[model samples]
Target: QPAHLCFRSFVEALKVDNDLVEINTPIDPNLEAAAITRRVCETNDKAPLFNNLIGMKNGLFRILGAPGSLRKSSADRYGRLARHLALPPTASMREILDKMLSASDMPPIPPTIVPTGPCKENSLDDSEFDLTELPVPLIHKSDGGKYIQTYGMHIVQSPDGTWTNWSIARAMVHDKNHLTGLVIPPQHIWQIHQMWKKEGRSDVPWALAFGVPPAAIMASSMPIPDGVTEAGYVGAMTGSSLELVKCDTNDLYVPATSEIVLEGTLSISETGPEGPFGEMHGYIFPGDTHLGAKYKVNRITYRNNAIMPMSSCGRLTDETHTMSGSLAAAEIRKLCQQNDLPITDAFAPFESQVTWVALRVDTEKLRAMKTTSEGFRKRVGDVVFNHKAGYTIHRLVLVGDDIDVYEGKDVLWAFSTRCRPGMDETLFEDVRGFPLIPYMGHGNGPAHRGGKVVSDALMPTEYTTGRNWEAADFNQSYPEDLKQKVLDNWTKMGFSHHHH
Candidate 1:
């Protein structure tokens, strides 16, 4: 952690901690770069920062992958995420959630305008701004094409000067001057695009900034409430104002110290083939060439020795789950408080890949309501199924006070034993899910709509008969004094203290 919370400082911190893997050998942008990233993500190794990419000069540009991957150290699974937020390596997920939630109370501080910065050290005008020259990696072999925007922040504003949205979406390179990607409905970017459509405009003005502030990247991945700008939240989170420089071709503003900036207009009338790449859900949807809207790059600006961050979005433990999943958990908790629900905590297990949520419920409050198991389940389901925060959640598992939602083993034990085959399950139909969810497109369901299951992982007797509850585990079954005695002398008794 450092005073300045940006990409360059983060990289320097990673180097100091020996958490970054510096590669001097030239690697191809086709599959070599992406394959290496996938391996690091799966193995929980140090992040790879490729210094010399094939077809590029040493200081021209570089690619850093697995920006939010887990650390190899046993004590800190959230070490990389903590670095991005300027927290300690040993910070817990709940601690990070608290930091994000607390930022909402602070007044938003808009970015300060700067005349110029390092990002303008080199500039490419319309004809000279060719994206093909950049080291954009073909992430996966089965990908439709080289995607230049796996982790870049796309900035767009509403028709009026009211709302500015910064979000991340996949974009495949269609040509030297264009890219194609999704601008689906319900997302803020899509909502802004629709406003432009009503204005009889074919293209929406946009600017994509890569290698922005580390805090900015994390905020972009978050699904904060609408009308709350990411730039303002970033300033609140970092406890410092963000500096910006206006784009040459558009009125949009980007981080002044960003490594690369692509000023462009997203074409609504034109489109090209897009996707077949591995998505965040850990699978690839192979189908006919999907036509997606075109993004015309008219100008490019960058600093010397610019570096672009990339995330291989195939599996868990990547930025997709670490950053995005944490944001989902925070939002769900916020919404639960707003709706007056009795939910104590909420977490999306990393293994679930952001599809399953484990909600810790307050059984004391449940007892006060004097409701049946099915009745309580229905009430919780109604809120989550209708709430905006629950859009990507496919399964909601409820647990009592004894279980810790963060621990996978505790959640599985509760789910496996308490959740019966059909009795404790309730399904909500006609709910919309992300199209990239594998089951939605291939399984037996409607095109874009699917069923979500709310499983009551608590016994019926707990609500009706009030039976005595006990656990067979050593920690819960024994008294605190006896447990503390054993724990203090654990290592001295020829045993080691380790995480399960």
Candidate 2:
């Protein structure tokens, strides 16, 4: 099944669809790859498949990274993102979101233990493997150190071995056999770390998988409920059990086809001065460096010609913007429906860098509920911010059907014309905010429990009746026939040469 499909398969499909570019030119891992990635991502171009690296010694080492861009001129704007979710290359945003939603709705199928797989093709123990030897791309010049774990899934299981969690977090290469990263209690990784500490274990057993199956990568970022293993849901996502191979060093299981896997123990007594680096929120606050959770890399294993993935945290439309944003939107929308909210659709505008979540309300359903404007807005924030995914949200835009969430400017236009400042917005000071938000850490706020607002983007009359004002945009202003006729004549009028 596609969920179990290897990263090699996705890379092949990406190349076939003109969505990937194989660059053989010798590239430096320092800032060259990052600069190239930022340019390609910003241009909505193909993923850069770097086959040659300055520090790489042989044909076995390669690094690949994609921002998961929305190719504006392609038949599938979301083709890159769709492929990551194991969907058809041309799947629409709605279809891509539905695939995630439907998987959660089904019963989870746990992973099937496998004796061995391609991931074991080569093994490097602590004596042989060296962190600095690999060409782990340094994302930002402002960063304090090299962050290589931004795009990989860190596998940590409860000491009891009954619950497993797969999640993504940034970790910097501290030494040849050591790493350190941000570990907060709110994250499952830290939570499991605490569990081990309580049992008198200073180091938590850990395994980090790189180039995991594409579907599994999507699941890694998903806001799955605590205590549920992510591997099971991956199976449900593709209707087949995930095949796993035992880590050569630890008891943890990782996707059998993973390109690279690092088995190690996360330390409790040790600390590494890490960070001051850019984050998903797209900023590198001055002197943000701190003592991060230290990790001891005991073993390193990978298949032949292993490929490692990287995510250069940027302002907009990167993996942080596309994949994580899409997953959060889907999770929020599904949770809204489960809680009987009037939400029809949800989106995290990439321009906002995944902090602004716009949820379009069902006008009819909301009107029938006879709820006050403030009441509805507050309800949306209360429900959304309480969820794990919603913790990263900075502002929740409560939109009406007239506003198209995907059309970035349309959402802003509604906020400008409709939302009454200081009145249409509801504040949730009690809610949680992600630390990555620049304001939450730099400015005055309650640590992570910062001020989060729900801006009512709906027009005044949308609460109880029809729209008080009509949209004057091209599609909304003119008759359907007139619009179609204009579109029909554009080709004949020579505008086709400039416009699509």
Candidate 3:
């Protein structure tokens, strides 16, 4: 099946239904646009599609704020993410996750190449290209510079051209012709950069595609196994091959329908100060600036009315939680199943800000194993915390099947009631962690060897051969027949049965 899965189409769908609001009122590109976007995400309101920017000329670009926020309605809170994957707007979270997992079984479909596309409608060569001409927004007041690339996908490949990686990283505008961004180690993008550096190359060819296909963006944030090309996985997710067009200067391919594409080479020998910008962890380290790789732009291509989507990184439910955290849970769940671990579900709660992962245990399987709580916890920690995807996770909350990993209240309830203050909690020292984590580089230990916590929220009896404890919740306390009778008469007794 062929899919018309462009960002414009997705935005049009949102606009048609009023899920996306077009802001005609002139807005400053400095910090105002970003502030408005953050408020939209905080309130779970309509996405802002800015038509009037203060500095940029008309047709240069439009700004999309809160591109990954949840919809306002309760029935379809995951509508934005659902629509991106070609699913109905009313699809449930479980349905969307099920769709993503199902793609693993399908054969990978490579993209179809095309000669020309909308992204190339307007072009500027190196002489005319200016990074400052676009409406790059200063996301936060303390940011080092205008961040133009928090939401764009960076497309790069290995020297042998056998592995292609599409990922997202922050890039701050440094000058008219250059931008500096993180090239952190161990990530696929960093690994590719290392290959170029290892060969004594001065720079690695790179292309930044803004306003790419919806499925492509989602896949860009997923932590799939290395050597897996996200483009092919995106095709499997949408049940169609992605259409691609070769970059004007680079050999890499970009989405044919992308709104903007920046072709450049990432400098290996040169570095610049980047960051001080607020991160997904919801904090900006004061006076924190790191020497980062620089990108030298050679060509800029965009459509007549190009649009740039941005994620205002701070707090929960941004791309940090929705895309990265949610997909991280799915990856861990898949890995658990592969390792024969008895986990019912796994998720990173929004309240944890993507730092804590709650893994729901399969109680029946735990009983069958007849292992002690300490034994079981150590087994899971050995497998999960050691995985490549576990580097960023700082806390692991283990709950029983009664708790829903996705529900913050349920996980918190489990923690409050079942978890002991010190007995049930365990610590793992010298585990790897990301330095960007707010607490990591400072008071927590050496950023590279920061510790990890595992809180066992299941009762001690759960690990025994049997359990005598029944939960104290209303769902567990009341008999099913009585509960059904009450629920059946809920409407007649002057109460609404509408669940929030």
lDDT of 1 by residue, 228-322 (tens): 88888888877888999999998999988888899999875787898877888898866647888789999889888888889987786798888
Looking at model 2, residue 19 earns an lDDT score of 74
TM-score of each: 0.94, 0.95, 0.95
Please report, as a residue range, the 10-residue window in candidate 1 with the lowest summed lDDT. Answer: 1-10
The Cα error of candidate 3 at residue 173, in Å, is: 0.5
Per TM-score, the best of the predicted structures is: 3
Candidate 3 lDDT: 0.83
Tens-place lDDT per residue, model 3, 191-304, is: 889898898855889999999998888888877788888899888877788899999897999999898899989987899988887888888876786788899999989988
> Residue by residue across 124-171, what tens digits does model 2's lDDT show?
887887898888888899887888888889999998988899998789
Q: Which stretches of candidate 1 lie over 4 Å from their true place?
A: 1-4, 57-60, 461-467, 484-500
Q: Which of the two, 2 or 3, has more lDDT? A: 3
In model 3, how large is the Cα lDDT of residue 99? 70
Tell me the whole-model lDDT of each prediction, alpha carbons only. 0.82, 0.82, 0.83
After the best TM-score superposition of candidate 1, give how far the Cα of residue 265 lies from its true spot, in angstroms. Answer: 0.6
Which residue pairs show collisions in model 2?
Answer: none
